[PDB]
Amino acid sequence: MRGLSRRVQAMKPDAVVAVNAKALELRRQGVDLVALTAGEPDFDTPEHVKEAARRALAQGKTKYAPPAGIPELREALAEKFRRENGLSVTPEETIVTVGGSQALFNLFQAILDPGDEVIVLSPYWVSYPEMVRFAGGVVVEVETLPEEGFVPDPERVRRAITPRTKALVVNSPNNPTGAVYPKEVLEALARLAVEHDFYLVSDEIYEHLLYEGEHFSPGRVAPEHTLTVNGAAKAFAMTGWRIGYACGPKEVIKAMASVSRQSTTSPDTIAQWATLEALTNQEASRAFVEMAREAYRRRRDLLLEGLTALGLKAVRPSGAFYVLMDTSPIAPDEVRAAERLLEAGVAVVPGTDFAAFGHVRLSYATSEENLRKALERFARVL
Amino acid sequence: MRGLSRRVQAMKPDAVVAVNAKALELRRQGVDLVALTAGEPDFDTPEHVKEAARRALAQGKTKYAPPAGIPELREALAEKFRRENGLSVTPEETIVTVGGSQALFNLFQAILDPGDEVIVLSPYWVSYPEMVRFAGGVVVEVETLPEEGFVPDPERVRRAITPRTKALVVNSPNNPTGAVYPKEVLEALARLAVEHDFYLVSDEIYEHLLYEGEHFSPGRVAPEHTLTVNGAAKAFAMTGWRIGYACGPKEVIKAMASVSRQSTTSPDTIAQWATLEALTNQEASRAFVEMAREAYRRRRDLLLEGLTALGLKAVRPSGAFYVLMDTSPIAPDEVRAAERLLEAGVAVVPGTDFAAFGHVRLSYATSEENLRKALERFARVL
Numbered sequence: 001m002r003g004l005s006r007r008v009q010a011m012k013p014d015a016v017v018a019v020n021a022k023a024l025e026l027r028r029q030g031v032d033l034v035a036l037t038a039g040e041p042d043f044d045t046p047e048h049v050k051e052a053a054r055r056a057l058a059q060g061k062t063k064y065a066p067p068a069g070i071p072e073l074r075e076a077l078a079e080k081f082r083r084e085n086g087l088s089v090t091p092e093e094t095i096v097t098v099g100g101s102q103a104l105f106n107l108f109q110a111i112l113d114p115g116d117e118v119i120v121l122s123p124y125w126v127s128y129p130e131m132v133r134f135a136g137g138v139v140v141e142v143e144t145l146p147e148e149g150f151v152p153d154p155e156r157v158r159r160a161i162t163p164r165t166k167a168l169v170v171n172s173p174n175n176p177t178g179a180v181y182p183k184e185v186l187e188a189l190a191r192l193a194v195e196h197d198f199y200l201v202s203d204e205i206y207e208h209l210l211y212e213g214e215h216f217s218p219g220r221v222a223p224e225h226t227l228t229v230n231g232a233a234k235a236f237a238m239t240g241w242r243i244g245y246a247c248g249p250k251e252v253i254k255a256m257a258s259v260s261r262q263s264t265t266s267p268d269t270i271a272q273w274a275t276l277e278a279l280t281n282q283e284a285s286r287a288f289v290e291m292a293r294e295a296y297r298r299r300r301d302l303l304l305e306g307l308t309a310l311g312l313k314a315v316r317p318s319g320a321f322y323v324l325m326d327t328s329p330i331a332p333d334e335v336r337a338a339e340r341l342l343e344a345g346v347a348v349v350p351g352t353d354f355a356a357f358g359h360v361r362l363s364y365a366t367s368e369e370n371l372r373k374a375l376e377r378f379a380r381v382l
Numbered sequence: 383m384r385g386l387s388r389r390v391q392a393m394k395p396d397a398v399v400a401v402n403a404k405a406l407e408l409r410r411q412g413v414d415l416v417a418l419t420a421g422e423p424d425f426d427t428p429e430h431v432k433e434a435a436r437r438a439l440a441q442g443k444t445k446y447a448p449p450a451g452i453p454e455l456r457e458a459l460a461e462k463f464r465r466e467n468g469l470s471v472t473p474e475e476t477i478v479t480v481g482g483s484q485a486l487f488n489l490f491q492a493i494l495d496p497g498d499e500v501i502v503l504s505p506y507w508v509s510y511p512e513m514v515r516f517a518g519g520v521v522v523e524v525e526t527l528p529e530e531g532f533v534p535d536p537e538r539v540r541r542a543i544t545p546r547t548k549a550l551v552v553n554s555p556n557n558p559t560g561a562v563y564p565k566e567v568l569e570a571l572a573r574l575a576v577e578h579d580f581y582l583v584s585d586e587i588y589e590h591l592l593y594e595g596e597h598f599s600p601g602r603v604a605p606e607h608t609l610t611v612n613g614a615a616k617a618f619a620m621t622g623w624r625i626g627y628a629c630g631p632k633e634v635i636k637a638m639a640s641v642s643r644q645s646t647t648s649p650d651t652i653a654q655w656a657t658l659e660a661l662t663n664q665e666a667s668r669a670f671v672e673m674a675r676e677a678y679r680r681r682r683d684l685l686l687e688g689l690t691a692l693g694l695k696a697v698r699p700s701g702a703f704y705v706l707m708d709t710s711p712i713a714p715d716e717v718r719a720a721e722r723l724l725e726a727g728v729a730v731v732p733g734t735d736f737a738a739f740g741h742v743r744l745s746y747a748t749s750e751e752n753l754r755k756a757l758e759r760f761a762r763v764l
């Protein structure tokens with residue numbers, strides 16, 4: 001006959017793509033609002049990366065690359081993972097995907113079989129459930145109270161494990177909470193993964209925007225269970241470039257590569273080479289990051305002081321560039337609250353799809369002047 | 383527990399990807415062969431496309447693009463479809479995927495539900511079945527005789543339709559045969575699609591590398607059923623860039639866009655703006671194609687002459703850059719035949735996965751002095 005699939009019909013739109021369009025036609029019509037929806041860093045990607053891309057175009061590095069990505073990058077990848085993380089992977093247990101998304105997607109398609117349960121920790125990033133389910137998974141979620149600073153309690157994460165449980169998904173530095181879990185909790189969870197025998201999917205990516213704490217990887221602890229997902233996007237201001245990467249069990253990272261070969265065929269060649277440089281040129285990249293962090297950090301202190309001065313309540317993030325604000329007095333729920341704020345010319349993303357009810361996700365990853373302006377517009381609404 | 387899925391385990395490796403690696407350690411050890419495994423044009427991509435890319439880097443066009451691709455490209459896309467094809471789509475009924483592969487993938491994930499049958503005509507391009515099945519489809523295949531020069535006979539394609547039947551997939555100018563189906567057969571096939579009610583998936587792509595015939599699109603005929611898939615790769619020597627596109631029913635084109643948002647998030651920004659230029663700068667592109675065409679046409683004739691002279695049998699392609707050679711006198715089957723040829727230092731791809739048994743796929747998309755040598759090496763094998 002004709003008609004769409006159950007899976008596609010069944011899937012929810014987007015918390016953030018929504019607020020974006022509904023800016024532009026408010027913003028497209030005179031009304032200038034301030035937009036704190038941001039997932040991307042205001043900074044432009046580094047000149048040596050841009051450079052390297054140019055070098056590739058020139059050399060004619062424009063043909064089909066391997067499904068798992070170019071050797072040079074995989075090789076350089078297995079190295080960042082050791083140097084920076086203590087993971088001890090070889091280039092065969094490394095893969096470069098079309099962004100950290102394609103990694104998370106191709107992962108769940110390789111493990112997840114229908115009815116398999118994936119434990120997920122709320123407040124959580126919008127897409128985990130969508131993609132768990134798209135594969136035929138079953139989201140089994142565990143809350144993380146704000147009083148206990150949004151860091152998982154091992155004991156209860158334990159009492160969510162069932163014989164159908166196939167994966168646990170931990171993300172530190174946290175989006176949308178900004179929390180950064182201590183070593184011995186990643187230690188703890190990594191252990192339940194080994195104990196009950198199921199993968200542990202760690203979405204590291206925000207590792208470098210770390211203001212206060214120490215970033216621990218569980219793949220140091222449970223290497224034959226852990227799947228460590230990272231990407232170029234957030235650290236190197238390379239979101240539009242579309243490059244992410246991962247490492248773990250040789251076998252699953254080839255199930256992944258074969259989905260990749262039939263879905264995208266292989267990431268855009270130019271960008272691979274461009275990434276190779278951000279990775280191999282320590283000294284240059286070491287500085288961009290260094291500049292970006294302290295940068296976001298001052299905005300992080302700006303938002304929070306003005307926010308707290310205003311009366312609004314929020315959890316001081318230690319990493320990433322998000323802040324879940326308590327819309328409690330600005331409205332009675334997080335949706336009418338959201339509109340009230342769009343009315344004060346400031347686009348926020350409702351905590352609804354993150355299971356962060358009665359909260360809205362602020363983003364200081366934009367300008368110093370938008371946090372000053374957005375904080376002024378909040379001020380009047382109150 | 384732990385282990386891979388029944389979908390990933392179940393998939394077969396790659397016919398072409400195999401021959402490639404197995405060159406390189408034969409190649410990568412003294413032995414130079416002649417590799418007619420080629421899917422890519424030996425020409426490098428046009429300089430105005432390269433420059434447009436540079437122009438984007440410069441302009442800092444490096445942030446997240448929308449899931450369906452940038453507006454400018456969508457609008458420019460909808461035009462190429464009208465102008466060059468007669469399909470009257472609006473940019474909303476247009477989408478830019480991460481290659482023609484991702485389009486074909488995201489498509490079947492949007493229509494195809496488990497047990498749904500997809501008619502596919504053999505000889506056929508390796509990946510169609512692979513990805514019909516990955517989604518939960520059921521390949522139902524129809525043979526096309528070489529005596530009838532590999533063009534489908536609508537009547538028998540008719541008697542393969544069952545109430546399970548959800549899509550038909552035609553690709554002219556054909557994948558490994560090189561055939562280009564007549565106006566009234568695409569007309570015929572497009573008709574059944576409407577009559578019996580089921581989508582028609584047209585994999586046009588090779589439209590521009592046509593030597594003798596006229597490229598007809600069925601979306602002219604059955605616009606509410608057809609899903610027209612094309613891409614930058616083959617025409618503009620842009621394989622490595624990773625960019626493809628499609629058009630059709632506004633509904634399945636955003637079911638598609640919705641998968642895209644969670645699989646790739648969106649194609650590589652730089653390559654979008656690079657493509658926009660190839661699409662809008664007519665005069666420049668109009669010439670590269672013109673050059674490439676006649677180029678491939680001559681190699682197409684060199685190969686055919688020398689092959690015909692040598693005694694070997696083959697079907698005179700009218701489009702694309704493949705030729706399905708009859709390994710009949712080179713060995714008793716198409717796989718031992720394949721090896722006897724790697725012996726004479728010439729890598730071919732066995733017709734086995736294309737359901738082109740007793741045939742082997744040569745590809746004149748390489749040099750005029752590779753056809754010369756490869757033809758020489760065939761000669762010696764006798």
Ligand SMILES: Cc1ncc(COP(=O)(O)O)c(CN[C@@H](Cc2c[nH]c3ccccc23)C(=O)O)c1O
Nearest residue numbers: 016037038039099100101125175231233244446647
């Ligand atoms: C925790 C997390 N994991 C992965 C990704 C995607 O990484 P990839 O390497 O695939 O690109 C993210 C990404 N992004 C944002 C999205 C977002 C928020 N506001 C936006 C405005 C415009 C465009 C995109 C926006 C997010 O965190 O919501 C994250 O965070």
Ligand SMILES: Cc1ncc(COP(=O)(O)O)c(CN[C@@H](Cc2c[nH]c3ccccc23)C(=O)O)c1O
Nearest residue numbers: 064265398420421481482483484507557613615626
């Ligand atoms: C008929 C047809 N449709 C789609 C594609 C894929 O196009 P996309 O825009 O996704 O890149 C193919 C093209 N080419 C090849 C497959 C092939 C050979 N060697 C390759 C290396 C890398 C990627 C793809 C390769 C083929 O016929 O062998 C086809 O043909």
